[PDB]
Design an enzyme around this catalytic site. Sequence first.
Site, PDB file in Angstrom:
ATOM      1  N   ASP A  12      48.117   9.135  57.219  1.00 41.36           N
ATOM      2  CA  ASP A  12      47.687   8.401  56.024  1.00 41.36           C
ATOM      3  C   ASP A  12      48.823   7.525  55.470  1.00 41.36           C
ATOM      4  OD1 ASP A  12      45.574  10.385  56.379  1.00 41.36           O
ATOM      5  OD2 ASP A  12      46.580  11.735  54.942  1.00 41.36           O
ATOM      6  N   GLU A 191      36.217   7.328  53.956  1.00 34.71           N
ATOM      7  CA  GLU A 191      37.364   7.454  53.051  1.00 34.71           C
ATOM      8  C   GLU A 191      38.419   6.354  53.291  1.00 34.71           C
ATOM      9  OE1 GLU A 191      38.431  11.378  54.432  1.00 34.71           O
ATOM     10  OE2 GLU A 191      39.497  10.651  56.211  1.00 34.71           O
TER      11      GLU A 191
END
Length: 306
Positions: A12, A191
């Site tokens: 991420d 997401e």
Amino acid sequence: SGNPILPGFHADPEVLYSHQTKRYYIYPTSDGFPGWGGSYFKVFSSKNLKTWKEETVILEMGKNVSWANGNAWAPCIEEKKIDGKYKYFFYYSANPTTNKGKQIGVAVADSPTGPFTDLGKPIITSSPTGRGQQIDVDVFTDPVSGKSYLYWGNGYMAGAELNDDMLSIKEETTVVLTPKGGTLQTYAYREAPYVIYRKGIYYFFWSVDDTGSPNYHVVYGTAQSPLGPIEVAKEPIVLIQNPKEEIYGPAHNSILQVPGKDKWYIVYHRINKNHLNDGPGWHREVCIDRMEFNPDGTIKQVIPTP
């Protein structure tokens, strides 16, 4: 050798260019922990985007964050110049000690390597849809207006204007931006929202499918306004797997614009090839690749390098 650019297990990634230090920084999730148990955030720095150095740990849940006890994930950062001094606004999600679901918080610093001071409380503690999760925060300043915005969400995508001090959102400005429809094979929203501006167009990136799947990929849409509505691109896949080059699940991206140039890079993670059926979702590695824009304004599909 190229990718991965960060050693070990990281995911991420957020990427930043600091006009203060004239260096590039990557702020990832500390990966390699089962059930994404990482409780602290690292920072890696570079001068050239080829060679990356690990800096000091900037934030540890509990120790530096009184309201959180773990699952320090997927941060974002904004550098602003205010009254001749550079200020950093670092947003992230963590597990609260109350165990009332993941929440988003904010930490501030005077340097991209810190020290960072947490607010003392989370700033986003509920879903605008009643579903999904309050994770995968992104921050963006509109170059046209100067207004700053937060984007976030797993299951939904939301955006809201930030207050001037950057420590809270203006609740009344919250917009549910979730792109409608799509499939796990096209653009179905999961997401990791990411927002950029280029030549009058707002670009919205997001990830499709699960992080433990080789089909984890990046898609995009556009708008004429930072709070949408998002028009999903005709050909929306930005970055997808290349099994023939052993590139699996390349997503949860950030975007770097070279300072003062129309040169762009995509920063993402991918499943480490040795962990496809041995905890793929928590054995990921951070990569970088060039991202080019077509003359018409569409994004040319990124060619991920092994």
